[PDB]
Structures are given as C-alpha cells and as structure tokens.
A paper describes a structure:
Ciliary movement is generated by the axoneme, a molecular machine consisting of microtubules, ATP-powered dynein motors and regulatory complexes. The prototypic axoneme of a motile cilium consists of a cylindrical arrangement of doublet microtubules (DMTs) surrounding a central apparatus comprising two singlet microtubules. DMTs are organized into 96-nm repeating units, which cryo-electron tomography (cryo-ET) studies have shown to be a landscape of interconnected dynein motors and regulatory complexes. In total, there are 11 dynein motors in a single 96-nm repeat unit, and they are classified according to their location (inner and outer) and the number of heavy chains (HCs) they have.
Computational limits imposed by the large size of the repeat meant that we focused on individual axonemal complexes by particle subtraction, refinement and classification before reconstituting the full 96-nm repeat in silico. The model includes all three classes of axonemal dynein: the triple-headed ODA, the regulatory double-headed IDAf and all six single-headed IDAs (IDAa–IDAe and IDAg). IDAf is attached to the DMT through a multipartite docking mechanism involving four different anchors. The N terminus of FAP44 binds the fα motor through a pair of β-propellers and its C terminus forms a coiled coil with FAP43 across the DMT surface, terminating at the inner junction between the A and B tubules. Our atomic model shows that the 11-subunit N-DRC is built around long, bifurcated coiled coils that are joined together at a ‘bulb’ on the microtubule-bound baseplate and fork at the N-terminal leucine-rich repeat (LRR) domain of DRC3. OIDL3 involves the LRR domain of the N-DRC subunit DRC7. Specifically, a three-helix bundle of DRC3 contacts the linker of the IDAg motor. The core of IDAf rotates 6° relative to the DMT, whereas the N-DRC linker tilts by 9°.
Author numbering:
A (entry chain IA): 358 to 408
B (entry chain Hx): 53 to 104
C (entry chain Hi): 8 to 68
D (entry chain IF): 2 to 123, 143 to 269
E (entry chain IU), F (entry chain Ia): 134 to 346
Write the structure that this text describes.
Amino acid sequence: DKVPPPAWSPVFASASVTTRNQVAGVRSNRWPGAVCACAGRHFTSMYVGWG
Amino acid sequence: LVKKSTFDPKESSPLVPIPVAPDATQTQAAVSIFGDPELPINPATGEPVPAD
Amino acid sequence: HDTAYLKETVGEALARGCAAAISAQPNDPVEYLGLWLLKYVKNAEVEGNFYRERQQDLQKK
Amino acid sequence: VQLEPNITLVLKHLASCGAVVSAEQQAALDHSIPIKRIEAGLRSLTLWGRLTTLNGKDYLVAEGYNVASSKEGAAVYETKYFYSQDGARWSDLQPVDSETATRCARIKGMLSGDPAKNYELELVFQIPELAVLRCRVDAIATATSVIPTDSTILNAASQVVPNRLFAGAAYPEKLESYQHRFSLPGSGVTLSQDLRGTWAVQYDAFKGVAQVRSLLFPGYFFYYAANELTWGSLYVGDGLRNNDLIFML
Amino acid sequence: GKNKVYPLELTLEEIFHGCLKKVAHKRKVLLFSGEYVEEERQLTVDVKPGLPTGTRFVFEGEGNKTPKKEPGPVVFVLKPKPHPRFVRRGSDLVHKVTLPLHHALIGTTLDIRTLDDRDLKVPISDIMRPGSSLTVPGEGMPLPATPSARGNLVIEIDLLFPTHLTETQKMLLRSAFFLPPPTEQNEETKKALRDYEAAFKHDLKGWATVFKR
Amino acid sequence: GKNKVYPLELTLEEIFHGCLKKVAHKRKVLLFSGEYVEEERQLTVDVKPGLPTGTRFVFEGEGNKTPKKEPGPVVFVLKPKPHPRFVRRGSDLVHKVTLPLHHALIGTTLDIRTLDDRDLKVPISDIMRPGSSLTVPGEGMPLPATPSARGNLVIEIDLLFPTHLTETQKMLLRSAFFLPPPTEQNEETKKALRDYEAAFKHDLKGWATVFKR
C-alpha cells in the first residue's frame, strides 16, 4: 500500500463494545513487543520480545 | 499383501447416510453470549428490523 | 479346440470368481463377477509393485 | 503418546514466549472449537496461531485435517484452515491458486483488520487480503511445522497415524529429535537437515521441557514435555519472513 | 421399433451419494381378448454418484409384448427433483442468495448448508459487484469419471438494497464515500472521527449494539 | 427470379428526423461481348421518420438485365449505424450508463444528450437496484404510424462499485446503515451527529468539499 503504517496500533480486550469493565491500551508498531495498558487510574507499560 | 488384495465391491447403498453427532443446542446457547448479535435484516425491505 | 482354449485361458480365474460369488451371495452375481475379475487383474500388478517398493526401501536404508 | 495437542497446554507452556491469547478469547475458544469441529466434519481441529493486524482485531487461525496419507514420498495432510477475528464465529480460508500465490509473496507489511481489503500491485492487479493471509499461513506451515520424530507411523493402505507406542525422544535438546510433519516416518529427514543456524533449542533438563524457536520465522514456537509426552506448536506475531539471517547471526 | 421412456426423479442428495432405486413397470401383453393382461415388474437401477442429468437407462427385453414382435426395451431417463437451496449446472452447484447491501460493502460470511452433512461459512472476499459471484472450489457434484474429484460451488450473489434512507443517513454515506486518505486528513478530521466513533460505540447511549424487539 | 439486396446504413439522427438518401446502383447488362458492360444509376430513397429497422425498399425494373428476361427488382434494407450513446430497441431508445454507488444511494442527476439537440437531465428517483432501470416518457424514437408521439427513453443502470474501502470508511458505512429512526435516537446520539456534521462540513478543515489536484 501507498499509505505508511502508523505506529502505536490499538489493542482491545473484548469483542463486544458494551462490556462494563474492559481494559484498553496501545501497542507499538516500530518496536514489536512493547505494549501500554491502562484501566482507570492503573496504567503500566511493558516490552517483551526480541530486541 | 492380503490386506491389499481383498476384494471390496462397494455398491450404492439404498439409503442416504445419516450423521451421528451429539446435540449442540446447549453449547450453541453458551457461544451466543460472546460478541454482539447483529440486527437481522428484514427480507421484505433491506432496512433493519426494529430494535431496542 | 474351443474347450481347450477356454480352459487354459479363463478356466482357473472364473472358477475362483464363481466360488467367491457362492460364498458372498450378493444381490447381483453377474456384476459381482465382472468387478471381481477387474480387481483380479488389478491386485496382481500392484502385488509386483508392492514387492518392488519394499525391495527399494530396504536398499535405500 | 497423545493423539492431539491440547489448546490449554499449548497456551500454558508458551506464555513465557509471549504466545498468549485474550482471556475472553480463550473462553470463547473453548466453547466454539468443538462446534466448528462437528460442523465441518473433521476428526482433528486445533488452533494453529495468531496473526497481528494494524487493528486490535487480530486473526485467529486454526487448522484441521480429515485424512492424512503418504503420496509420492511426502506425508500429505488435507488440511482445512479457518480464521476468526474473535473466538466465537469461524470463517473459511479457501486455497489460493498458483498465479496469485506468487503475486502475494511480494506484498509485505503487517496486515490490516478487515478481511475485505484489496491490495493493489503492479497495469494494476487486485488481490484480496484473505488471499494474502492464506499465502503467509501456507508458507509458515511449509517451513515451520514440526513434530517429534517417530511420532507417526504408516499402517496398511499407506496412511500416517499417530504412534500409540511412542516412548518419547531421547536427547530432546538435539535437533535430530524433531522432524517436519510432511516427512515420512521411514525417511531420516529431520530439522538437522535444514539450515545450520535457523533453529534454536532451549532445553530445561530438570523440568524436562524442551523449547524450539524458529529464527527464520521469529514468531514460531514449539514445546515438547519429556516427563509426559505432550508437544504443541503455535505461531504468534506477523507472518512476515526474516530474510537477512546471515547478518543477524 | 418403439420404446417407452419413463421419467425418473431423484433428489440432489441421492445423486451426490449414489442411490439404488427400485422401480415398478407395467407390462401389457396383448392377446385375443379385448382387454390386455398387465403385470407389475420390479427393476433395480443403480445410479452412481455424480451422474449427469439426462442419463438413459435401458432394460432390453422388458415392455409391452405384442403376440408376434418381441417387446422393445424400456427407457429410464434421469431428472433431478427441485431443491430448496442448490440447482445443479454441469458438474457443480449453483446457490443463489439474496444479500443486503451493507453485507456486500463491509463484508460478512455467507452461511450455507451443503448436500453433505457439513456446514460452510464462506466469507465475502471483497466488494461484491452487482451480478458478481463467489466460487468455492471442491464443493459441487463429484465427477462421474472419478469418485474423488468435486466441482466448485458457485454462489450467484443477488444484492438487496435498502428501501428507505433518511437525509441524515445519506449525509453519513456521502462522508464515508469521500473520506480523504489517512495520509491527508487534518488533525481536526482525526479528532472528529475519533469523537464520532466513541459516541457511536457507546455502551449505553450508543446505537452500535441494539436488541431486537 | 433473383433480386439484389443492398444494406443501407443510416445514423440514428437521420432516422429520427427523416433523411433523403441518394444511392448509386451499378446495373449490369449482358451483351455479345465476353465481358459485361455496366452503368451507374442514381436512386432517391425517402426514409420516413422513425421507420423500424429492417424496412425493405424495392425498386421495380432496376437490376441486372439478361437479354431475355426483364431484370428483377433491387432491394434496399435499412440498418442503423452504431451510435456512441443510444441503441434503438423497437420504438424507443436505450441508454446504458455506468453509475457510481454513492450516486445510486444518495441520488444524483444523470446527463444525457438526446438525438434532438436538447440536453436532458433526469434525477435519480430512488435507490437504484442492481440491474434496475429508469424510464423517461416521451423521449424515444418517433412512432412510424403517427409523426408526433414517440417512445420512452430507457436508462439501463449498471452500478460501479468502489474498489477499495478502509476500515474507518466501513465503520462510517455501518453507522449509516444501522442508524436508529429519528424518533428513537438518544439525546447523546443527536448531539454526536450534530458534532460530526459540523466537522465534516467545516469550511476550512472539513472534507465536505475539496478541489481536485
């Protein structure tokens, strides 16, 4: 494609969008394995995979 | 060699085969709680059926 | 003559097929006998094929 | 000694390698795998892997075969592939013809989410994303599908069946104890016959768990428990290929 | 000289699997009496899987027997009974399905029940054109020549367009049909789309998920 | 009893208005010489407005003249030349136009130039179905019987579906194809729609109207 892929692709935790308490974060595209998540006031980042 | 040399005259059985499968009504109901069921489309008019 | 031609050509194979039809007791012996003869020539050639394949695998190993 | 790898054991043993699935997707997987197995008339159906997409809706791919026989010296499995954004409902993955099988390998970059996306390639050629997805799964399966050696045996009528008396593979750390699925039991073709530096094996001798990772395809993992005979594989990550292997090593 | 042809009706399932049909024949032997003498004769016809339509089965020696001339053979012609889902064409099957417009564009999975006891859920590969079709290999009638190969099931797509559309619905359609490429959208456009999607997929006040009544 | 049949090619404009064609005929008379001698004759044929295709014009006494028998008539058959826009189907014209998908749903106005030098703009009345058509009464070929009444121009619609759609474009399409009726929308829904519309039609940073590059 002629459209460059943007970094920080979204990641979800539920197929349905009406779940009450679902976590949601982002996942980096430049570095595969780095993920950031946040549930209300509790957020955390972590990177697992090849460097 | 005996196994390979056995005659097997496979003939057309008069009855169509029927499948032996356990009932899946219970399991199908459990699956339906996952995901959002899309609103069915009225065959008469392509607009979706009324909903709440 | 004709009897000698029939005996030495298809005499043995037909007798075996008739014996199989007697024991099996199918719903259509003529078709059963015909398919039996077609299988009769088919299993003979694959029997040689089977022996060749087994010999080849041992030599390769 | 097993006849089919468990979905739970594969997810449990590969959690360290990042091969994990969402908890709700895991719950949906348990219910919907038997449903699809009966609906498709298959005697075997297990999760093959998970592919990352530009959207959060990743592709969950599960393969299944009904018959498996020896054909021209290659163990041919009539595999059927299915994909599903979520663990509830599965769709089919049709085979790709040769002409589009060569024009799909030139398309790179991690896939999008909607399977109704058409890539344009050079006059312009239109190719569906599902065709591209099928290509990558086939390529990975050809290069990475690995099972322990002697785990399959040939019965009469030339069919490959699981070895019910498989006692396990001695020296699980050595690469000679693992072989490709499409390798005949008689042939001594193993993963050692592949490239020297494309397979990495880390064996936990105490716990008796051997782990195999593919360096040519970085997203492929395979475990083999030795104390209890249980082996499984799962591909997690994008389906792209690692070309410059000589520089990395 | 003269032969009697009899239509023979089978279902698509029998042709797919291979039936062994039994048929009763009324043979009229003609004699000096004004009325004829009739008898019921049973015949076994073996239809093999995937036989083409129009196959003729002929039984030599059976038929109405005039006193002098030996009766001519009776002819059985194969024709398939109508099926609610599949109509056969050549060696494969045709499945005509009416499809909603939004299913064509966004893309969904067509769910069909095969003649064999298997259930297929074929996805919509791309934007189905009006009058286009989707082909699934190896899902039709078995080849009469070889009992292993199969034809490719053909799904003739028919589009069901919505009957009504509001002015606000058309406005949303126009915006979606002229959206700039993602490498051209402004920051206001990106924020506006994010706000609309969040307010469209709202768990309580959003209309993304609704329950039918 | 042989006759000479010669095709006559006319444009749709000539048949619509009524032309007066002058044709040249090469008549051969056989003499004592080994080779023949021929002459060119001028024939005036008057085609009436809206004559049906296949009309036969016969000129009695015109044709190759054998020494004994009086020459048979020469036959002229009327056939129309291909036209870039219209193809006639009986008493009325047929126009095949490729239509964009968003033109079909939202509704636009087609542009058609008639055989008469009058431009025509016909609005799209509703959701054009795939394979449907539109009819404009009184815009067809003149009736051969009466020189005032005409047929009705028929537009044959072949939809042109978009080739690529992004995930965000599909999301907007789903929201447009499942919008609740205006008597059911929430207050949040009405606010969200008003916000999105004001941003899509933004005078400086909206994509409602743009200039082609």
